[PDB]
Amino acid sequence: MRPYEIMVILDPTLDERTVAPSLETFLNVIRKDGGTVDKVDIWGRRRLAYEIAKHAEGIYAVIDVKAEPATVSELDRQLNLNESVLRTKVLRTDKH
Amino acid sequence: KNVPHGAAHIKSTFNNTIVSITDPQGNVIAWASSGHVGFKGSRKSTPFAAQLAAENAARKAQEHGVKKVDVFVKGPGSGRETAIRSLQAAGLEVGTISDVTPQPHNGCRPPKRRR
Amino acid sequence: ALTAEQKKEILGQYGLHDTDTGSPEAQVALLTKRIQDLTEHLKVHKHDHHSRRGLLLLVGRRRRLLKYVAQVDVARYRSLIERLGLRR
């Protein structure tokens, strides 16, 4: 599979008590595709460069994956269609 | 009523000069310009117009109860610092300066050239 | 694109022996594979002209190799051709 590394930023209204399982509810779809290496970082409540929807901070997050193009695309689709996510951005670990 | 401390916006361009006092929130109290000072047409790019306009507006703000000012400048101005000297002559405390002339990130097409 | 896996497959089938690369048979086979895939790509992308130029170049060298092999031995020529399903 192809390696990828996803960023997500969230409103501070959520909490670290909710962060990881809330995302794993999505990522189970990928785990039932590849047995994919999920590996999360959480370093949040972090002030912003500039406000999005008048939010001074966000709950940053980094998600390392080894998966396939369709699965990353559908993940992105579900997340962006979610009510909670501010942003998401998708970058390939490999050479290109 | 009154406000003791607020902010000031200074728009100097090629063919006119104008100022406005305002709260940090955005609510004006008082403004002036070279047209109200009396000059007309083509004379009112000179820094002398800036002196007189800023002076009148600062005195209006002294009337409405201002003592200190934040200052924000904008645009091609021969008499920016001239207006600044006029303000600080008028009896007001210069809070903070910032040369925010609005630059775009290579956006809307500007007009053509002249000759 | 083409991977070592696919190339070794095609060279296992069409290669004279396990080393050959200059085999016109192998070369033609790989080019035709590449061209089939690229044509599938241009089904969707009708406008990737910068890729269509590569397509035409590959067709050129393909017909050159066929022309060589027909100059040499038409038996081998038509063997390869019937083996790949071309019309020429």
């Binding site: 460069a49 942003r87 951005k89 | 925010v100 | -």
Partner: protein, 84 residues
Amino acid sequence: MMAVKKSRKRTAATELKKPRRNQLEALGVTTIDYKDVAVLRTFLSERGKIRSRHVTGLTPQQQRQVATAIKNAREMALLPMAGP
């Protein structure tokens, strides 16, 4: 003890000077990541804009890599871009 040039004394120096610099492989680096904004803030001005090669020293490789990282960072608001 020695001059910036006429280095007839040491080996060919593994050191950098005012014309020559490859500042990232030189020092100030963990790895080129849009995550590490404290490092990317070094290749800017206070007004947020970006430096040049005859200012910094980088090769175009590192320059363009870093600029792309910076720009992704401004997109994800990890870095204070110049604005209102």
